Amino acid sequence: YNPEFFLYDIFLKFCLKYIDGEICHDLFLLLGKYNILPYDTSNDSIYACTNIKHLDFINPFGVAAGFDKNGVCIDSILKLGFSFIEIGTITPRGQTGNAKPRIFRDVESRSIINSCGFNNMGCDKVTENLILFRKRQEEDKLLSKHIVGVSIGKNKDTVNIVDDLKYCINKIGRYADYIAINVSSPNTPGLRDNQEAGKLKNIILSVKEEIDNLEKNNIMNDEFLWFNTTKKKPLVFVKLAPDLNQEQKKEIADVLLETNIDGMIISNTTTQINDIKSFENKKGGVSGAKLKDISTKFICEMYNYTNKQIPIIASGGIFSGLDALEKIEAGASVCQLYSCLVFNGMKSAVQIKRELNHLLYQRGYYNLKEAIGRKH
Numbered sequence: 001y002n003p004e005f006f007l008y009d010i011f012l013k014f015c016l017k018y019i020d021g022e023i024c025h026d027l028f029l030l031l032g033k034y035n036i037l038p039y040d041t042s043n044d045s046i047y048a049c050t051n052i053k054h055l056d057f058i059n060p061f062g063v064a065a066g067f068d069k070n071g072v073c074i075d076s077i078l079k080l081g082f083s084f085i086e087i088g089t090i091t092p093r094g095q096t097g098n099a100k101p102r103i104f105r106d107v108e109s110r111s112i113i114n115s116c117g118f119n120n121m122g123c124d125k126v127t128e129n130l131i132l133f134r135k136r137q138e139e140d141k142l143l144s145k146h147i148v149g150v151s152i153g154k155n156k157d158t159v160n161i162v163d164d165l166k167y168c169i170n171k172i173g174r175y176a177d178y179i180a181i182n183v184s185s186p187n188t189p190g191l192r193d194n195q196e197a198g199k200l201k202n203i204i205l206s207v208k209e210e211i212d213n214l215e216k217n218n219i220m221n222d223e224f225l226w227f228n229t230t231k232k233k234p235l236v237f238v239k240l241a242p243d244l245n246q247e248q249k250k251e252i253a254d255v256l257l258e259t260n261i262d263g264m265i266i267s268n269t270t271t272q273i274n275d276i277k278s279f280e281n282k283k284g285g286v287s288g289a290k291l292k293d294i295s296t297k298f299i300c301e302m303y304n305y306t307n308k309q310i311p312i313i314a315s316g317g318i319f320s321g322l323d324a325l326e327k328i329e330a331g332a333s334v335c336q337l338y339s340c341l342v343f344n345g346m347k348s349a350v351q352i353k354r355e356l357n358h359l360l361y362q363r364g365y366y367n368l369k370e371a372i373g374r375k376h
């Protein structure tokens, strides 16, 4: 019972019908900047705790990349009831993006189409913000167990992807719990060509290597170097696009097994949806419910491509507790939300968290970890 939630749900219906999508995004981020967003301070179910190696998540719901592309709103977003957040995608130097008429919504289909183009303030400034949060985190008990991941990418005009990725790792590595490599954005020309097994292999090795390089050349203990939640080196995940052929998707898996990737996010937006009349002749990748079923199979695909050896992070059309369980049973260990917060709002995390707890009770599972890969 926290009345501070519904006050915002009143205005939600207004926004979906009148306010431009990005104007709603900036407004939301502004609210959390001033710490006036609702609070979910109830303990989470110990049966819902999940992990990926030494990453321990209090609950299995964070917000996906592109939500807080610059980490100026981490404190409040997390306090809504999310265990972690993925900030970014970030690039070395700031970028403005594309034609500001970028993101559009369709309420009925619960879908979104976006053509942002990695609009961010740059690696240096976003690093300043994350540092401020980590300091606030040490003096706040509502942030003591929460995790922050950083999605990294390349500028549109970069000549080589590896160079940009490394500059980020070397500037913001110490403050990240994990690092997700975004080589799947459909709104930045090219990039997806890096999904080729050869270049993807070199990419993964370079990133994993670059993170390993931060320890050696220090004068202090490993305890003080990592100013993060784990106090350990950041793990390396990779985000993949759904628009691949089955042959490339087994090539991809081969790279992840060969390179010992710590995780595989599944998945980003798609460019194959063409049955939304309000989205006809509009550029960008589609998000929301229409991406649900497509991504789910991609989990089963990659969970069987990779021989169950790489944990999977679920992202795509997740709105309800049963949606999350679908992702879990397919092979995912954790879930990310975005469109759910666009259409369901600030009450999303609490809503979806109560629904998942209740479903695990009826399905007979003792805890969440028991459900990964069970309807295969």
Ligand SMILES: Cc1cc2nc3c(=O)[nH]c(=O)nc-3n(C[C@H](O)[C@H](O)[C@H](O)COP(=O)(O)O)c2cc1C
Residues within 6 Å of the ligand: 064, 065, 066, 067, 069, 088, 089, 103, 112, 113, 114, 116, 118, 151, 182, 239, 267, 268, 269, 287, 288, 289, 291, 315, 316, 317, 318, 336, 337, 338, 339, 340
């Ligand atoms: C406006 C917008 C911006 C996004 N920006 C990023 C991004 O910068 N990096 C990334 O990896 N994914 C980005 N995404 C994709 C989301 O992180 C997520 O994968 C996708 O929206 C599916 O989630 P959903 O179906 O729950 O909405 C973005 C999506 C939208 C709608």
Ligand SMILES: CCn1cc(C2CC2)c2c([C@H](N)c3ccc(C(F)(F)F)nc3)n(C)nc2c1=O
Residues within 6 Å of the ligand: 008, 011, 012, 015, 016, 020, 021, 022, 024, 025, 027, 028, 029, 031, 103, 105, 112, 341, 342, 343, 344, 345, 346
């Ligand atoms: C696709 C961009 N993006 C993002 C959001 C997410 C940022 C939180 C959108 C929302 C959101 N559910 C919301 C609720 C309440 C308010 C307000 F103003 F009441 F505080 N603002 C935004 N909405 C309605 N549209 C979004 C969007 O387009």
Ligand SMILES: O=c1cc(C(O)O)[nH]c(=O)[nH]1
Residues within 6 Å of the ligand: 066, 089, 114, 115, 116, 117, 118, 119, 182, 184, 185, 186, 187, 188, 268, 269, 285, 286
């Ligand atoms: O990975 C990404 C990136 C973008 C963007 O910045 O435009 N948009 C998406 O839908 N996915």
